[PDB]
Structure 1
Amino acid sequence: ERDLFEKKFKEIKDKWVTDKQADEFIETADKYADKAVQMSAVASRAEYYRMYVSRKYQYKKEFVEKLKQVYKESGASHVTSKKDLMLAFDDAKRKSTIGRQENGLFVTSFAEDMALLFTDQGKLKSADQIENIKGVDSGKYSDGVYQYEYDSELTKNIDKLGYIRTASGDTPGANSLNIPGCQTWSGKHIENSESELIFPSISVKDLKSKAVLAEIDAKGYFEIIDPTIIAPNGDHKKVTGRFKIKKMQD
């Protein structure tokens, strides 16, 4: 049962996941099981484990709807590196999109990144600390911790089109460490976990990578207003709201 879950993880474990990450993953597995139950994304810890093994992540509509409230309150966030940001504009196989074209971009709630990434006194945390919080490699935010932000209204009118998705096991960009429950696996420290949804990708066609960073260094942000998004069916469409590409500061 859990035994079955432990057997799948070894089966699908990606080359990049370290013995340390693997140890912590299996070790703390049942806390993520129970977090799933407490959010009422699942009935039992057993159900969580079956779902991981089966790769089909289904949720009750009642739960998904309650989640999207916090998203709708202060909007959405996706923390990224300068390096990966650049890759979105300059990597030609991606077709100038922030996200995986029609497959979307992973995000959390904006309120969660704000509370989790910031000191209560209002100061941004160490790159070293945030790297830890996000379960990424040491030094991946050394030259800045940047952020994609969908504002509250952009999010609100996205939901209206019906374009918010949940992550599942066959979702492009999912891997061994992806997890049922609309929740990221953030290592041994589970209270650094956050919600995960899939919002549609922003088109940044014709946009220049170097321009965006210069524009961000000059002001602290760069914005797209009435952004063209990409729906699952893949059509390009404009949606009323704001999308900022910030470098985060105090």
Structure 2
Amino acid sequence: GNMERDIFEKKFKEIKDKWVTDKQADEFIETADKYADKAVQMSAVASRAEYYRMYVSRKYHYKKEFVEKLKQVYKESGASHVTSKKDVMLAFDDAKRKSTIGRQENGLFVTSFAEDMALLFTDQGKLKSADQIENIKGVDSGKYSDGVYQYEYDSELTKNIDKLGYIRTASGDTPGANSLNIPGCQTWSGKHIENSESELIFPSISVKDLKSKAVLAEIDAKGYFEIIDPTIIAPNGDHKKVTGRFKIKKMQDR
């Protein structure tokens, strides 16, 4: 065999979540080396072996130049987190979330806005079906049956967030990481590795005093709800007003 993949598999089995199906678990193991190789090609990790070693250590580290290169993509197009209407409601309504989108100072997992734009639309600029997008994103069937919602940090917001030094990479023990998270600043997208997108952690957005009912109505009427110069939560818990635009969208045809 190979010791690196033996420890990889052992560690996965130890941490596997109860929602993971036997099929997903089997795909996660079988496809592991393709994701390792993708990370090498992206200069995200030193070697395929190092990918497995870092996965087991739970401590994901990356070279400065690689992260700077990756941040460039996000600075150019902004950042995207696709979610359900139910989860949008929870940000406002669920008290433990403390009126923040993202896990308070622990942030929000994002990909680049460009990547979601490329992946979620057909060549005719039509939003893919809820079914297709649920498959792409590896979520439960019906997750987006009420709409594919999207958090968007614009380029200006993203740039100013980077200037503050607030962008993070995920690690094994990041809140919100689960047993299907992997190293390489990339998502695990099952057998269809062509659906894998880059992954960073952005600072959460404060929605203090906003009401879910009203925000969702504005989205229904106009397609989006926007916060100009939002308050963000820093990694250290500082609340800071940052120039730019954050949007909560219901995604639609172009």
User: Which portions of structure 1, spanning 4 or more consecutive aligned residues, are displaced by more than 3 angstroms?
Assistant: none
Aligned-residue offset at 1:44: 1.1
Q: CA deviation at 1:175?
A: 1.2
Give CA deviations for 1:229-250 in whole Å, capped at 9, x if unaligned. Answer: 0001101110000001000000
Deviation at 1:100, TM superposition (A): 0.4
2:165 is the counterpart of 1:162: yes
Distance 1:249 1:15 in 2: 33
SS in 1 for 2:90: helix
Q: RMSD of aligned C-alpha atoms?
A: 0.6
Q: 1:90: how far off?
A: 0.4
Cα-to-partner distance string for 1:202-239 (whole Å, 9 max, x where unaligned): 00011100101101001001000000000011011100
Secondary structure at 2:176 match in 1: coil
Q: In the TM superposition, what whole-angstrom CA distance separates every residue of 1:86-138 from its partner, at most 9, and x where no partner exists?
A: 11110100100000000000000000000000111111000000000001111
Query: Displacement, 1:18?
Result: 0.6
- Write the distance in 1 (CA, Å) between the matches of 2:77 and 2:43: 22
Structure 1 length-normalised TM: 0.99
Whole-angstrom distance in 2 between the partners of 1:139 and 1:76: 24
The 10-residue stretch of structure 1 (57-66 or 170-179) with the greater mean CA deviation from structure 2: 170-179
Residue 110 of structure 1 aligns with which residue?
A: 113
2:95, 2:45 → 1: CA distance?
A: 40
Measure, in 2, the Cα distance between the counterparts of 1:77 and 1:12.
27
Matches within 5 A, 1:87-166: 87-166=90-169
Q: Map Cα deviations across residues 32-61 of structure 1 (whole Å, 9 max, x no partner).
A: 010010001112110000011110000000
1:13 and 1:175 mapped to 2: Cα distance?
8
Distance 1:167 1:82 in 2: 25
**1:133-172 CA distances to partner (integer Å, 9 max, x unpaired)?**
0011111000100000000000011000000000001111
**Quick check: 1:218 aligned with 2:221?**
yes
| Inter-partner Cα distance in structure 1 for 2:149 and 2:174 | 24
Alignment partners' CA distance in 2, 1:75 and 1:232: 19
2:21 is the alignment partner of 1:18? yes
Query: How far did 1:17 drift?
Result: 0.5
Q: 2:246 aligns to what SS in structure 1?
A: strand
Using the alignment, how far apart are the partners of 2:7 and 2:175 within structure 1? 24
Structure 1 SS opposite 2:224? coil
Instruction: Give me the whole-angstrom Cα distance separating, in 1, the residues matched to 2:15 and 2:77.
Output: 36
In 2: Cα distance, 1:10 partner to 1:96 partner? 35
Distance in 2, matches of 1:54 and 1:43, equals 15
Instruction: Give the TM-score normalised by the residue count of structure 2.
Output: 0.98
Matched, 1:29 2:29: no
Deviations 1:155-197 (CA, angstroms, capped at 9, x unpaired): 0110000000000011111111110000111111001000010
- Segments of 5+ residues of structure 1 without an aligned counterpart are none
| Contiguous gaps of at least 5 residues in structure 2 | none
2 CA distance for matches of 1:237 and 1:78? 21
Question: Following the alignment from structure 2 to structure 1, what is the Cα–Cα distance between the partners of residues 68 and 229?
Answer: 24
Q: Distance in 2 between matches of 1:178 and 1:42?
A: 15
Q: C-alpha separation between the residues in 1 aligned to 2:164 and 2:250?
A: 29
